[PDB]
Ligand binder design. Structure first.
Ligand SMILES: *[C@@H]1O[C@H](CO[C@@H]2O[C@@H](C)[C@@H](O)[C@@H](O)[C@@H]2O)[C@@H](O[C@@H]2O[C@H](CO)[C@@H](O[C@@H]3O[C@H](CO[C@H]4O[C@H](CO)[C@@H](O)[C@H](O)[C@@H]4O)[C@@H](O)[C@H](O[C@H]4O[C@H](CO)[C@@H](O)[C@H](O)[C@@H]4O[C@H]4O[C@H](CO)[C@@H](O)[C@H](O)[C@@H]4O)[C@@H]3O)[C@H](O)[C@H]2NC(C)=O)[C@H](O)[C@H]1NC(C)=O
Ligand SMILES: [Cl-]
Lengths: 212, 215, 198, 216, 220
């Protein structure tokens, strides 16, 4: 990366935050052609600023850009939840361009949301294939931190557990999933299996059974 | 930085010649068109001629082709206007005006008064313009036959300023100047108020106070 | 001394108004002499960059022809008036060749082009299909159809007018103030020497 | 030769009005080499505009120059008192060949005021020296046009009189004029009736003031 | 509308080659310049290559110079990127982007305002592996879905009822299992009363392995 950028930044809901972008005298410091891009998870980058401070049609006046030397800056005021995204700066560099390393913005002061949890037993098609997979789907929660625990009856389950890293969905909330691998014999050996989802000190527990 | 300084005023007798100078500072002299402009009293501006010092080829208006020669000296950045066979119609202020090839602005000197007259420095005679007996009356002073300009006229040592009209002097055919200064007062105060005009002529060191009384 | 005329450089550097960069003015200077010391001894210039010629040596050289291009651009754009440079102005407005021989002269003109009166509407070309060749001039004002619907000669959603004003009226930073630029191109060809120093 | 003719000769306006001065050229003149000058009485000309439209140092923005080809114009958007003066245009260039316009005088408009006329006999002390000066005074009139005819024994004089006019008065916007008839003592004693006749727009009829040499 | 669509992503072994394509519509391709920008995992946007309208001006980043070749066919409104000698660092999501105005560098001057969705390119010696699709049967709303288990590489695309069912649909990010295979599950929430009425069919598509499965999810 030729243009450095702080990996993260933060600010409170309704307040402001500044994201800097430091290059050299041949790109950011050589021209007034610094752009800013917003990328929400799963979407293409959106142009927010061009020529240091100009806004495309449709970009709110909460976003303003400035420059002072080799360091450009983006200021987001009236911080809202949808503002949580990645922000990259761009600059002409003489018959080429360059992007900053990128900055992940976190908007603090949000209401916590507990997750929705759905636990699926192994399908009859998978059991017929001498396989068994429990599926535990976790959605609609904020912030992203979450702890998943599997239980066979009331005792903890050791291995066969695969869990995502929580990621953001379309409505700026997090989603995660955990998979428990079992042999068909193990699945029918215990009376029930449980998925314990602990998030911000509160626990959600869903349970499935072979017979039920 | 650019500045044009002309030589001092001159008094020439008819038939003689005069060579006015114009020193330029600032480096734009050589690459300039340096002209001479003339303004006779009560008249407009008249371009006499000009020269480019790099080439030394002067050009002249038709009116001045005969008796005016314009030269330029690059070594000293000075232009000259020499006029021979001076006549009283040549009494004027003479300006050098210059245009650099690098700009469109014009640079002007301060002007050089050239008076063509055969008179020496002389103080003025002061005669009364007495108010007539036959609601406001007019009185004045005739300040006649002085050289050169100027004269100052006050009334009652500056205590009387309202209604005073001091006219610009005229160059008489004799070569001496003459001007009148009048004032209008109430005819009722002609016998009660004393009116004295104070003429001062610094070139000749002449102070004259004349009492203007009714006839 | 062979050509007995003074080069009329005044109507280039000293004009009341300059042209917009997209429609840059060019005056051809031929058969005349000029005391260039008046130029390179001036302190009124914030930019005096020569290429292929020494500024203090202009009186020692003779040239077959001299070209004087003049226009107004933003301050931060003056560095694009140089060989090898790129940018909105160099690509779409005024472009110097890689082998340019001449001088780029610029000075701040906020006092002339950003006066409280106004009416001086300086503009530039936002976009062009291909970059300008060196010393190419484009004064087209054709509305560009960037979308699917024909424009019929009016601005619109994807119907862009190719020119835009600089917006010099308000007070802005020095980098955003108007700068007058004169580009002297000295051509030493096989023709006789006409424009000399003195 | 190029001839620059200005119009009008005199421009009579009030403070706060807009002044439009014309400068016509006999040929096409480059607008890079046309200037305007302001001149107040007793002062050297003040460069106002150069290059058709550039303001010299210190010139207020209410002065604007324009035009091209053969028609040039100086516009004073709002006349201040200090603006009433004479304005010259000038054609120049990078060759020694310049011309000026004959000028335009911008003066204060005012109601017509007739002149008060006074005649003054030569003083006795002056007559001791052999010369007689007869002074005719035209006081506080408007407009400036006025005729002064000298009559000596009802014989109309010419060639022996000199006139002087004051500049327009800053208070009442009037002019004043003095005509001085000069005769030798020998001529002055040959004749009896001395009169100056004054013609002016503010007078229904020419006014004559006179005296008989020797009467009290 | 103005649009850019990338195609040609997939799996490729180190040292081998892969070709990307970008289709353009809604604007006059014939006089614009287009650029490629990639997004590597754990890194930021990186400019890759540019090409002018007439292919007269071509630029490359120093990381890809000598290995990538950009080219265009204005008659087909298409832009190509030939990627040779691919390394592990070349694994990224490759975007096709342009500026609002014509001009080679005008996308840098005024910004890249139209981007494509991107095309994933995965450089790995691991071989392709197609997924097994199992239904997740539902047991006044109910949640059903289907499980896309054990596949490589990313990504898979899941739709419901050939894309007719989009309301209530949530397809989750995939796990990278210790075995090295990805597993993912897509779930839709539907009203309880329509279980015996509406037919629910998940459409899994894993282009690397040419896998196209239509699995019906019905109650137990
Ligand atoms: C068209 O061209 C016109 C002519 O330009 C001149 O002539 C051409 C041939 C060429 O040589 C030019 O280089 C040359 O300037 C333009 O008119 C000229 O415009 C100039 C810039 O606007 C202007 O110069 C300024 O003048 C002021 C004041 O003048 C002095 O003299 C008068 C008497 O004549 C005194 O009453 C004053 O007190 C002044 O002393 C002057 O202060 C400015 O100079 C500053 O900068 C200089 C270096 O560039 C310094 O030498 C100087 O000290 C001064 O101060 C600097 O330093 C200070 C610290 O000591 C600091 O405080 C300050 O901020 C400065 O940094 C300046 O030179 C000309 O006077 C003017 N000429 C005429 C005749 O009007 C015209 O603008 C052009 N028109 C267009 C449309 O382009
Ligand atoms: Cl003349």
């Amino acid at each position: 990366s030729v243009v450095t950028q702080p990996p993260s930044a933060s600010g409170s809901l309704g307040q402001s935050v500044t994201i800097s972008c430091t290059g050299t005298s041949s790109d950011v410091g050589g021209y007034n052609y610094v752009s800013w891009y917003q990328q929400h998870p799963g979407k293409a980058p959106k142009l927010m600023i061009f020529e240091v401070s100009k806004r495309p049609s449709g970009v709110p006046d909460r976003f303003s850009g400035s420059k002072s030397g080799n360091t450009a800056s983006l200021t987001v005021s009236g911080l809202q939840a949808e503002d949580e995204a990645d922000y990259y700066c761009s600059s002409y560099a003489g018959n080429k361009g360059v992007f900053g390393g990128g900055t992940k913005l976190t908007v603090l002061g949000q209401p916590k949301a507990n997750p929705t949890v759905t636990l699926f037993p192994p399908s009859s098609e998978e059991l017929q294939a001498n396989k068994a997979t429990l599926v535990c789907l976790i959605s609609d929660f904020y912030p992203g931190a979450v702890t998943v625990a599997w239980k066979a009856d009331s005792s903890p389950v050791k291995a066969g557990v695969e869990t995502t890293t929580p990621s953001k969905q379309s409505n700026n909330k997090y989603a995660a999933s955990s998979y428990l691998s079992l042999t068909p014999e193990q699945w029918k050996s215990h009376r029930s299996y449980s998925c314990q989802v602990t998030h911000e000190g509160s626990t959600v527990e869903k349970t499935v059974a072979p017979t039920e | 930085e650019v500045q044009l300084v002309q030589s001092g005023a001159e008094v020439k007798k008819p038939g003689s010649s005069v060579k006015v100078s114009c020193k330029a500072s600032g480096g734009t002299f050589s690459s300039s068109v340096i002209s001479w402009v003339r303004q006779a009293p009560g008249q407009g501006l008249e371009w006499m001629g000009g020269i480019i010092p790099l080439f030394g080829s002067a050009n002249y208006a038709q009116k001045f082709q005969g008796r005016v020669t314009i030269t330029a000296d690059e070594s000293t950045s000075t232009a000259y206007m020499e006029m021979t066979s001076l006549r009283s119609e040549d009494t004027a202020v003479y300006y050098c005006a210059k245009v650099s090839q690098w700009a469109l602005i014009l640079f002007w000197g301060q002007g050089t008064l050239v008076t063509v007259s055969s008179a020496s420095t002389k103080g003025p005679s002061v005669f009364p313009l007495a108010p007539s007996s036959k609601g406001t009356a007019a009185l004045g002073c005739l300040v006649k036959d002085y050289f050169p300009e100027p004269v100052t006229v006050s009334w009652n040592s500056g205590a009387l300023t309202s209604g005073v009209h001091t006219f610009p002097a005229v160059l008489q055919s004799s070569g001496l100047y003459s001007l009148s200064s009048v004032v209008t007062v109430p005819s009722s105060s002609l016998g009660t108020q004393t009116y004295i005009c104070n003429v001062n002529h610094k070139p000749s060191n002449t102070k004259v106070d004349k009492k203007v009384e009714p006839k | 001394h062979h050509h007995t005329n003074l080069c009329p450089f005044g109507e280039v550097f000293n004009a009341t108004r300059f042209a917009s960069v997209y429609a840059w003015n060019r005056k051809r200077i031929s058969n005349c002499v000029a005391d260039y010391s008046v130029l390179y001894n001036s302190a009124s210039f914030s930019t005096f960059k020569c290429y292929g010629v020494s500024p203090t040596k202009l009186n020692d050289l003779c040239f077959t022809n001299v070209y004087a291009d003049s226009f107004v651009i933003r301050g931060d754009e003056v560095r694009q008036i140089a060989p090898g440079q790129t940018g909105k102005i160099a690509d779409y407005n005024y472009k110097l060749p890689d082998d340019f021989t001449g001088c780029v002269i610029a000075w701040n003109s906020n006092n002339l082009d950003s006066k409280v009166g106004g009416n001086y509407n300086y503009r530039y070309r936002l976009f062009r299909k291909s970059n300008l060749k060196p010393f190419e001039r484009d004064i087209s004002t054709e509305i560009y159809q960037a979308g699917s619907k024909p424009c019929n000669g009016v601005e619109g959603f994807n119907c862009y007018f190719p020119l835009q004003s600089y917006g010099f009226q308000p007070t802005n930073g020095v980098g955003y103030q108007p700068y007058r630029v004169v580009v002297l191109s000295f051509e030493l060809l096989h023709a006789p020497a006409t424009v000399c120093g003195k | 030769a190029i001839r620059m003719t200005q119009s009008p000769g005199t421009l009579s306006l009030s403070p706060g009005e807009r002044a439009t001065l014309s400068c016509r050229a006999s040929q096409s003149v480059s607008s890079s080499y046309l200037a305007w000058y302001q001149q107040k009485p007793g002062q050297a000309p003040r460069l106002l505009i150069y290059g058709a439209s550039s303001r010299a140092t210190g010139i207020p923005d209410r002065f604007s120059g324009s035009g091209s080809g053969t028609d040039f114009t100086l516009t004073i958007s709002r006349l201040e008192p200090e603006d009433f003066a004479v304005y010259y245009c000038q054609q120049y260039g990078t060759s020694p060949s310049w011309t000026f316009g004959q000028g335009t005088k911008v003066e204060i408009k005012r109601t017509v005021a007739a002149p008060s006329v006074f005649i003054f006999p030569p003083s006795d002390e002056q007559l001791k020296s052999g010369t007689a000066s007869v002074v005719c005074l035209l006081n506080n009139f408007y407009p400036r046009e006025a005729k002064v005819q000298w009559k000596v024994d009802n014989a109309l004089q010419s060639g022996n009189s000199q006139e002087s006019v004051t500049e327009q008065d800053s208070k009442d916007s009037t002019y004043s004029l003095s005509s001085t008839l000069t005769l030798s003592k020998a001529d002055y004693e040959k004749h009896k009736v001395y009169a100056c006749e004054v013609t002016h727009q503010g007078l229904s009829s020419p006014v004559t003031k006179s005296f008989n040499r020797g009467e009290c | 509308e103005v649009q850019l669509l990338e195609t040609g992503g997939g799996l490729v072994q180190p040292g081998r080659s892969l070709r990307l394509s970008c289709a353009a519509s809604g604007f006059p391709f014939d006089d614009y310049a287009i650029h490629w920008v990639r997004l590597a995992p754990g890194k930021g946007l990186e400019w890759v290559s540019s090409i002018s309208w007439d292919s007269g001006s071509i630029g490359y980043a120093d990381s890809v110079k000598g290995r990538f070749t950009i080219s265009r066919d204005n008659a087909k409104n298409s832009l190509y990127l030939q990627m040779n000698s691919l390394r592990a660092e070349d694994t990224a999501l490759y975007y096709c982007a342009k500026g609002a105005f014509p001009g080679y560098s005008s996308g840098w001057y005024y910004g890249l305002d139209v981007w494509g969705q991107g095309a994933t390119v995965t450089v790995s010696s691991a071989s392709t592996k197609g997924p097994s699709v199992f239904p997740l049967a539902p047991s006044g709303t109910a949640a059903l879905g289907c499980l896309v288990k054990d596949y490589f590489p990313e990504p898979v695309t899941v739709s419901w009822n050939s894309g007719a069912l989009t309301s209530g649909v949530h397809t989750f990010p995939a796990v990278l299992q210790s075995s090295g295979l990805y597993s993912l599950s897509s779930v839709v929430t539907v009203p309880s009363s329509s279980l015996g009425t509406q037919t629910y069919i998940c459409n899994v598509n894993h282009k690397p392995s040419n896998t196209k499965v239509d699995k019906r999810v019905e109650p137990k």
